[PDB]
Enzyme design. Structure first.
Site, PDB file in Angstrom:
ATOM      1  N   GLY A   1       1.166  -7.415   0.317  1.00 43.71           N
ATOM      2  CA  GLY A   1       0.294  -8.321  -0.491  1.00 43.71           C
ATOM      3  C   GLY A   1      -0.872  -8.828   0.366  1.00 43.71           C
TER       4      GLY A   1
ATOM      5  N   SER B   1      -3.389  -6.542   1.497  1.00 42.85           N
ATOM      6  CA  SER B   1      -4.437  -5.470   1.528  1.00 42.85           C
ATOM      7  C   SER B   1      -5.829  -6.092   1.384  1.00 42.85           C
ATOM      8  CB  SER B   1      -4.135  -4.573   0.328  1.00 42.85           C
ATOM      9  OG  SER B   1      -2.825  -4.041   0.456  1.00 42.85           O
TER      10      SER B   1
ATOM     11  N   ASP C   1      -9.076   6.184   0.145  1.00 43.06           N
ATOM     12  CA  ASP C   1      -8.542   4.882  -0.373  1.00 43.06           C
ATOM     13  C   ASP C   1      -9.617   3.798  -0.250  1.00 43.06           C
ATOM     14  OD1 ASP C   1      -6.859   2.899  -1.148  1.00 43.06           O
ATOM     15  OD2 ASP C   1      -5.136   3.366   0.260  1.00 43.06           O
TER      16      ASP C   1
ATOM     17  N   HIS D   1      -6.041   2.186  -3.913  1.00 36.64           N
ATOM     18  CA  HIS D   1      -4.653   2.331  -4.459  1.00 36.64           C
ATOM     19  C   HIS D   1      -4.243   1.060  -5.223  1.00 36.64           C
ATOM     20  CE1 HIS D   1      -3.239   0.175  -0.569  1.00 36.64           C
ATOM     21  NE2 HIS D   1      -2.825  -0.583  -1.569  1.00 36.64           N
TER      22      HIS D   1
HETATM   23  C1  LIG Z   1       2.412  -3.860   3.600  1.00 37.07           C
HETATM   24  C2  LIG Z   1       1.237  -3.867   2.957  1.00 37.07           C
HETATM   25  C3  LIG Z   1       0.318  -2.717   2.865  1.00 37.07           C
HETATM   26  C4  LIG Z   1      -1.131  -2.899   2.535  1.00 37.07           C
HETATM   27  C5  LIG Z   1      -0.238  -2.227   1.486  1.00 37.07           C
HETATM   28  N1  LIG Z   1      -0.356  -0.764   1.351  1.00 37.07           N
HETATM   29  C6  LIG Z   1       0.729   0.067   1.053  1.00 37.07           C
HETATM   30  O1  LIG Z   1       1.863  -0.369   0.823  1.00 37.07           O
HETATM   31  C7  LIG Z   1       0.419   1.592   1.104  1.00 37.07           C
HETATM   32  C8  LIG Z   1       0.068   2.133  -0.310  1.00 37.07           C
HETATM   33  C9  LIG Z   1       0.989   3.342  -0.564  1.00 37.07           C
HETATM   34  C10 LIG Z   1       2.164   3.106   0.398  1.00 37.07           C
HETATM   35  N2  LIG Z   1       1.626   2.346   1.506  1.00 37.07           N
HETATM   36  C11 LIG Z   1       1.983   2.492   2.849  1.00 37.07           C
HETATM   37  O2  LIG Z   1       1.265   2.053   3.746  1.00 37.07           O
HETATM   38  C12 LIG Z   1       3.363   3.176   3.189  1.00 37.07           C
HETATM   39  C13 LIG Z   1       4.502   2.109   3.092  1.00 37.07           C
HETATM   40  C14 LIG Z   1       5.817   2.518   3.791  1.00 37.07           C
HETATM   41  C15 LIG Z   1       6.910   1.667   3.135  1.00 37.07           C
HETATM   42  C16 LIG Z   1       6.282   1.056   1.889  1.00 37.07           C
HETATM   43  C17 LIG Z   1       5.001   1.841   1.667  1.00 37.07           C
HETATM   44  N3  LIG Z   1       3.274   3.744   4.560  1.00 37.07           N
HETATM   45  C18 LIG Z   1       2.617   4.927   4.820  1.00 37.07           C
HETATM   46  O3  LIG Z   1       2.148   5.642   3.937  1.00 37.07           O
HETATM   47  O4  LIG Z   1       2.582   5.155   6.179  1.00 37.07           O
HETATM   48  C19 LIG Z   1       1.826   6.303   6.687  1.00 37.07           C
HETATM   49  C20 LIG Z   1       2.454   6.683   8.027  1.00 37.07           C
HETATM   50  C21 LIG Z   1       1.308   7.276   8.813  1.00 37.07           C
HETATM   51  C22 LIG Z   1       0.154   6.334   8.501  1.00 37.07           C
HETATM   52  C23 LIG Z   1       0.353   5.921   7.014  1.00 37.07           C
HETATM   53  C24 LIG Z   1      -0.699   6.635   6.127  1.00 37.07           C
HETATM   54  C25 LIG Z   1      -0.623   6.261   4.640  1.00 37.07           C
HETATM   55  C26 LIG Z   1      -2.000   6.308   3.971  1.00 37.07           C
HETATM   56  C27 LIG Z   1      -1.916   6.346   2.443  1.00 37.07           C
HETATM   57  C28 LIG Z   1      -1.759   4.959   1.794  1.00 37.07           C
HETATM   58  C29 LIG Z   1      -1.972   5.064   0.295  1.00 37.07           C
HETATM   59  N4  LIG Z   1      -3.297   5.392  -0.082  1.00 37.07           N
HETATM   60  C30 LIG Z   1      -3.609   5.673  -1.406  1.00 37.07           C
HETATM   61  C31 LIG Z   1      -4.963   6.019  -1.780  1.00 37.07           C
HETATM   62  C32 LIG Z   1      -5.314   6.313  -3.166  1.00 37.07           C
HETATM   63  C33 LIG Z   1      -4.293   6.283  -4.205  1.00 37.07           C
HETATM   64  C34 LIG Z   1      -2.914   5.934  -3.865  1.00 37.07           C
HETATM   65  C35 LIG Z   1      -2.555   5.624  -2.475  1.00 37.07           C
HETATM   66  C36 LIG Z   1      -1.205   5.263  -2.059  1.00 37.07           C
HETATM   67  C37 LIG Z   1      -0.881   4.962  -0.663  1.00 37.07           C
HETATM   68  O5  LIG Z   1       0.359   4.590  -0.172  1.00 37.07           O
HETATM   69  C38 LIG Z   1      -0.101  -3.047   0.178  1.00 37.07           C
HETATM   70  O6  LIG Z   1       0.277  -4.208   0.209  1.00 37.07           O
HETATM   71  N5  LIG Z   1      -0.437  -2.362  -0.988  1.00 37.07           N
HETATM   72  S1  LIG Z   1      -0.507  -2.996  -2.507  1.00 37.07           S
HETATM   73  O7  LIG Z   1      -0.913  -1.903  -3.368  1.00 37.07           O
HETATM   74  O8  LIG Z   1       0.693  -3.745  -2.796  1.00 37.07           O
HETATM   75  C39 LIG Z   1      -1.925  -4.127  -2.535  1.00 37.07           C
HETATM   76  C40 LIG Z   1      -1.740  -5.340  -3.406  1.00 37.07           C
HETATM   77  C41 LIG Z   1      -1.702  -5.472  -1.906  1.00 37.07           C
END
Ligand SMILES: C=C[C@@H]1C[C@]1(NC(=O)[C@@H]1C[C@@H]2CN1C(=O)[C@H](C1CCCC1)NC(=O)O[C@@H]1CCC[C@H]1CCCCCc1nc3ccccc3cc1O2)C(=O)NS(=O)(=O)C1CC1
Ligand SMILES: [Zn+2]
Length: 160
Positions: free
Chosen positions: A116, A118, A60, A36
């Protein structure tokens, strides 16, 4: 014998993109990062432009294949429920195991604090790694539980 710095961890690397910033971990001689974050669009690394070799939106999971000769981490083989999560700021926190892909966070914090980070690989106190951070779980912005993918799942994708 010799002089060096930042010897705490060598299998964790830091990478930043134009709009997003995540980290990558070297496992089994293969670099793994979150899908993602990078997404379908490619990203230039230190060597130059590269093409994603592994991709999976449902899981993912995405990464590239590296040559042999570099130290790599292994899966956890000691039944360690307590695991430490690596954050972008080199922070350490114990996490209880509440499932194969889902666990609980000892200290409840806002998603922004854990945002931030991941790619932060989780390593048991024995020294082996259990997997990497994927997504945070919160009800109103507060993260109480964390979900990550196991190393065994990554092997299934590489084989295919
Ligand atoms: C707090 C940090 C987390 C590691 C992080 N991941 C995230 O923020 C992921 C990605 C989104 C939403 N998200 C979450 O975990 C959300 C959060 C709830 C409030 C804000 C969002 N919770 C969230 O779903 O919680 C559910 C609740 C049950 C478990 C959990 C399952 C979610 C799995 C899907 C995550 C995801 N996967 C993808 C795969 C391919 C393409 C697009 C995708 C988008 C996805 O989502 C992150 O920092 N992501 S980032 O892209 O900024 C990367 C640069 C660091
Ligand atoms: Zn272990």
């Amino acid at each position: 014998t010799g002089r060096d710095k930042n010897q705490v961890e060598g299998e964790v690397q830091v990478v930043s993109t134009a709009t997003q910033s995540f980290l990558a971990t070297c496992v089994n001689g293969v670099c793994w990062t979150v899908y993602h974050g990078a997404g379908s669009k490619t990203l230039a690394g230190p060597k130059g432009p590269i093409t994603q070799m592994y991709t999976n939106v449902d899981q993912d999971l995405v990464g590239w294949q590296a040559p042999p000769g570099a130290r790599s981490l292994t899966p956890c083989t000691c039944g360690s429920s307590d695991l430490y999560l690596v954050t972008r700021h080199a922070d350490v926190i114990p996490v209880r195991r509440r499932g194969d892909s889902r666990g609980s966070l000892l200290s409840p914090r806002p998603v922004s604090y854990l945002k931030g980070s991941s790619g932060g690989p989780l390593l048991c106190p024995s020294g082996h790694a259990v997997g990497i951070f994927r997504a945070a779980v919160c009800t109103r912005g507060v993260a109480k539980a964390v979900d990550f993918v196991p190393v065994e799942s990554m092997e299934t994708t590489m084989r295919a």
